[PDB]
Symmetry: none
Subunit: 38 residues, 10 copies
């Protein structure tokens, strides 16, 4: 007579002027805010 209860909790996010908001599992590419050449 087992009982399995899981709750991921309450998440509130307030974000302003955020370039990258989020979780990246794996990153091998390029993440650049601004690129100026020449």
């Amino acid at each position: 007579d087992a009982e399995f209860r899981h709750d991921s909790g309450y998440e509130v996010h307030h974000q302003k002027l955020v370039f990258f908001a989020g979780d990246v599992g794996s990153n091998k590419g390029a993440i650049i805010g601004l690129m100026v050449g020449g």
Copy 2:
């Protein structure tokens, strides 16, 4: 007599002026806000 209960929780997101809002599982490409050349 087992009971399996899962809840992913309450998610509230407020975002303004956010370039990339979201979760990337795997990133091998290029994510650039602005590209200026020459």
Copy 3:
């Protein structure tokens, strides 16, 4: 006599001036807000 109950939770999103709102499973292409050349 098992009981399987899954709930994905309540998701509320408020977004303004967001270039990319969403989750990318895998990214190998190019995601650029603005491209200026020459």
Copy 4:
């Protein structure tokens, strides 16, 4: 006597001035907001 119950939850999205709202499973093409050349 098993009972399988799945609920995907309540999703409310409010979006204004969003270039790309949505989830991309896999991305190998180009997603550019603006392209200026010459």
Copy 5:
């Protein structure tokens, strides 16, 4: 006089006896290999 060149690379996949081969941008439904009740 800018030059923008992007290549997504060479992808070779060999898969045998794979339930789910592919990238999911966002998952809120149920993905179960086998369901047995009663």
Copy 6:
């Protein structure tokens, strides 16, 4: 005098006995290989 060149690369897939081969942008339904009840 800008030059924009994009290539999505070479994709070779060999798959045998694969239930679901493909990329799902968003999944809220049920994907079950086998369902047995009673």
Copy 7:
């Protein structure tokens, strides 16, 4: 006179007896290999 060159590299995957091969950007649903109740 800028030059932008991006390469996503060479990816070779060999997989056998893999339940879930792929990258998930965000997961709020249930991913279970086998469910047995009662």
Copy 8:
């Protein structure tokens, strides 16, 4: 007669002018706020 109860807690985030807000599992690519060359 066991009872398994897990709670992920209450998370409140307030962020302004944040380049990268989020958790990266593994990082092998380049994350640069600004790139100026020439």
Copy 9:
């Protein structure tokens, strides 16, 4: 006269009897190999 060159490297993966092969950006759902109740 700047030159931007990015390479994501060579990735070779050999996997056998792997339940979940892949990178998850964010996980709030349940990932269980086997569920037995009652």
Copy 10:
């Protein structure tokens, strides 16, 4: 006259009988190999 060169290196992975092979950016859900109740 700047030159920006990035290489993500050579990655070779050999894995056998691995439940979860991959990088998780953020984990708030449940990851259980086996669940037995009752």
